[PDB]
Design an enzyme around this catalytic site. Structure first.
Site, PDB file in Angstrom:
ATOM      1  N   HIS B  41      40.354  30.601  34.407  1.00 44.17           N
ATOM      2  CA  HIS B  41      41.755  30.980  34.266  1.00 44.17           C
ATOM      3  C   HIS B  41      42.636  30.530  35.440  1.00 44.17           C
ATOM      4  CE1 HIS B  41      40.750  34.907  36.327  1.00 44.17           C
ATOM      5  NE2 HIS B  41      41.890  34.617  36.951  1.00 44.17           N
ATOM      6  N   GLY B 143      44.814  38.268  43.266  1.00 46.04           N
ATOM      7  CA  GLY B 143      44.377  37.277  44.246  1.00 46.04           C
ATOM      8  C   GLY B 143      42.888  37.361  44.539  1.00 46.04           C
ATOM      9  N   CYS B 145      40.520  37.213  42.355  1.00 41.69           N
ATOM     10  CA  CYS B 145      39.708  36.498  41.357  1.00 41.69           C
ATOM     11  C   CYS B 145      38.835  35.447  42.026  1.00 41.69           C
ATOM     12  CB  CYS B 145      40.571  35.901  40.247  1.00 41.69           C
ATOM     13  SG  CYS B 145      41.588  37.106  39.340  1.00 41.69           S
TER      14      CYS B 145
HETATM   15  O1  OZC Z   1      43.428  40.767  35.906  1.00 47.32           O
HETATM   16  C1  OZC Z   1      44.129  39.942  36.470  1.00 47.32           C
HETATM   17  C2  OZC Z   1      45.090  39.071  35.675  1.00 47.32           C
HETATM   18  C3  OZC Z   1      44.365  38.398  34.523  1.00 47.32           C
HETATM   19  C4  OZC Z   1      44.930  38.366  33.256  1.00 47.32           C
HETATM   20  C5  OZC Z   1      44.323  37.678  32.223  1.00 47.32           C
HETATM   21  C6  OZC Z   1      43.143  37.003  32.470  1.00 47.32           C
HETATM   22 CL1  OZC Z   1      42.479  35.970  31.236  1.00 47.32          CL
HETATM   23  C7  OZC Z   1      42.536  37.054  33.706  1.00 47.32           C
HETATM   24  C8  OZC Z   1      43.152  37.755  34.726  1.00 47.32           C
HETATM   25  C9  OZC Z   1      45.959  38.082  36.485  1.00 47.32           C
HETATM   26  C10 OZC Z   1      45.209  37.570  37.708  1.00 47.32           C
HETATM   27  C11 OZC Z   1      44.800  38.726  38.593  1.00 47.32           C
HETATM   28  N1  OZC Z   1      44.119  39.796  37.831  1.00 47.32           N
HETATM   29  C12 OZC Z   1      43.665  40.876  38.654  1.00 47.32           C
HETATM   30  C13 OZC Z   1      42.336  40.981  39.039  1.00 47.32           C
HETATM   31  N2  OZC Z   1      41.831  41.959  39.800  1.00 47.32           N
HETATM   32  C14 OZC Z   1      42.667  42.891  40.232  1.00 47.32           C
HETATM   33  C15 OZC Z   1      44.047  42.923  39.928  1.00 47.32           C
HETATM   34  C16 OZC Z   1      44.917  43.942  40.388  1.00 47.32           C
HETATM   35  C17 OZC Z   1      46.235  43.938  40.039  1.00 47.32           C
HETATM   36  C18 OZC Z   1      46.745  42.946  39.219  1.00 47.32           C
HETATM   37  C19 OZC Z   1      45.943  41.943  38.755  1.00 47.32           C
HETATM   38  C20 OZC Z   1      44.567  41.889  39.100  1.00 47.32           C
END
Ligand code: OZC
Ligand code: OZC
Lengths: 304, 304
Positions: B41, B143, B145
């Site tokens: 992603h 951030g 990920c």
């Molecule tokens: O879950 C996500 C998002 C997402 C959305 C869809 C798909 Cl396909 C993958 C990822 C955006 C990237 C970051 N992320 C996050 C990952 N960990 C903690 C997070 C804490 C607050 C906000 C977002 C967080």
């Protein structure tokens, strides 16, 4: 989101961990530049542990009696000295893995990461606080002596703790990196009183803000209090008296959530007077005090 | 003595953490040999997050569109491919800090350490378990990920987890290092059900043995039970059914304490049916299930 008992990445400290053997005794040492720091009780045996005269014991030891080993290589001890409860062994080689470092003596209530070591090799890392009674509720076994507590500020390692002993109560006592014990503890195998352990009120409040930030808001109430009224309640429940400095340090958390510090104090007051009623906060059934407001800000902002 | 939520020393993994930028998106990557592994992603934008056609999105990307940065240096991407939900960017240089490593897919109930990272830089390390519903109750911000979960066997790093997303429930979902999601989760921003989270019974028992080893014995009773009677109680309280494999894995802990596994099951049964009555076990007011019997043995023996 999510809130965890996070420790600092230990890599910078792992590169400083050496084994120090003196006679039949082996413990951990910290290699920074051309010096190895370790607990002075490495020179003792289990006989002379009841009443050691370290000046006398040290006099019977020479540079060659200290076997410092880093991984597989043996370091050459070209000098040795006692500084309070630590020995400083000067070696002929500077640690190529020495990070930027400082030796700081932390305050009770402050938190630090511990890298638990056995025979100069790291085995685990966990976060803990310097209890108000100057002890640490660590996880240490025979051989962990010389394991260090530290904090990291970007690339600078602040060494604050060196493990020396476990008290008969199961809790741990140790020194700063200048050999000064935190608390009234002496490096003697004798009955030592740890003292009354109180709860770090500013840390419980910081963790309550962390809970609101992450969604757990049930404990939030329609009440408020004052520093003196709240403190009457903190005294009965063996909580650290909350000062105006504590209120100020909670300022940024109070701003992030829009909850005034005295309103959070009233919520805490009700949790102390009424208990959790079987509920949890951040997955915990008790009030957590091992997160400082700096830890809550750092974890809820993502400082690397 | 003392019992803590210990994580593995993170140094070996810190030396693998890189930043991966694709377009306006930046997340963490894992550099092992001449390959950088990261969540696929990274190629998405916040628009095409509702329904990404990764094959289509990837086709519009070339080697030069992936900016891999290790500390300060920029790596040269000479190849790229999608393997399930991860991208493998082949770089022209092998990581000089690559430890001995394996990619293993762990089982629910198993624990691992997470090194949380932001912009390819490590910021924290904590221990956690793969929940029975395949989610992790982590501590992750936007951030994080590409942050990895791992275990260490002396000098060999077993990578088991890669963080991809936070579910709307606040818990986290991610993959093994081959891109396969743990659980039914897809890398789509859509309503996903985490499922019923049960308690890892073998882990709660292992932690009960750890408590006896460290002194907390109050919960110990004069009763015994059988696997089927205990299981009737585990089902009502949403506890993982205890099997004869679990009993066998608890064998060494049962030998260390002299307490039969079914006697410990009766003590647990009474703690579930009667609660703690305001008491604690290992400084916790709830039954802890994030320590496997291997973790309890390792921590109470001192494996480096
Ligand atoms: O879950 C996500 C998002 C997402 C959305 C869809 C798909 Cl396909 C993958 C990822 C955006 C990237 C970051 N992320 C996050 C990952 N960990 C903690 C997070 C804490 C607050 C906000 C977002 C967080
Ligand atoms: O406390 C001690 C002992 C001691 C005694 C006197 C003086 Cl002056 C210093 C140290 C011996 C060395 C190891 N040690 C220990 C330190 N941490 C965890 C321990 C867990 C179990 C057993 C001993 C432990």
């Amino acid at each position: 989101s999510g809130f965890r008992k996070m420790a600092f990445p230990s890599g910078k400290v792992e590169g400083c961990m050496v084994q120090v053997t003196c006679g039949t005794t082996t413990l951990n040492g910290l290699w920074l530049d051309d010096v190895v720091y370790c607990p002075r009780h490495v020179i003792c045996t289990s006989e002379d542990m009841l009443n050691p005269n370290y000046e006398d014991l040290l006099i019977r030891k020479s540079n060659h009696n200290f076997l410092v080993q880093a991984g597989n290589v043996q370091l050459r001890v070209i000098g040795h000295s006692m500084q309070n409860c630590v020995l400083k062994l000067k070696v002929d080689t500077a640690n190529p893995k020495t990070p930027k470092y400082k030796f700081v003596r932390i305050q009770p209530g402050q938190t630090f990461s511990v890298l638990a070591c056995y025979n100069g090799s790291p085995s685990g890392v966990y976060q803990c606080a310097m209890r108000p009674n100057f002890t640490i509720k660590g996880s240490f076994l025979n051989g962990s002596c010389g394991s260090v507590g530290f904090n990291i500020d970007y690339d600078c390692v602040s060494f604050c703790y060196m493990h020396h002993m476990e008290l008969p109560t199961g809790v741990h006592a140790g020194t700063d990196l200048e050999g000064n014990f935190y608390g009234p503890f002496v490096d003697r195998q004798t009955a030592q009183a740890a003292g009354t352990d109180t709860t770090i009120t500013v840390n419980v409040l910081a963790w309550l803000y962390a809970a609101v930030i992450n969604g757990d808001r049930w404990f939030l109430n329609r009440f408020t209090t004052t520093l003196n009224d709240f403190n009457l309640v903190a005294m009965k429940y063996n909580y650290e008296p909350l000062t105006q400095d504590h209120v100020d340090i909670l300022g940024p958390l109070s701003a992030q959530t829009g909850i005034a510090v005295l309103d959070m104090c009233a919520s805490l007051k009700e949790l102390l007077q009424n208990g959790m009623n079987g509920r949890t906060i951040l997955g915990s059934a008790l009030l957590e005090d091992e997160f400082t407001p700096f830890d809550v800000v750092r974890q809820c902002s993502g400082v690397t």
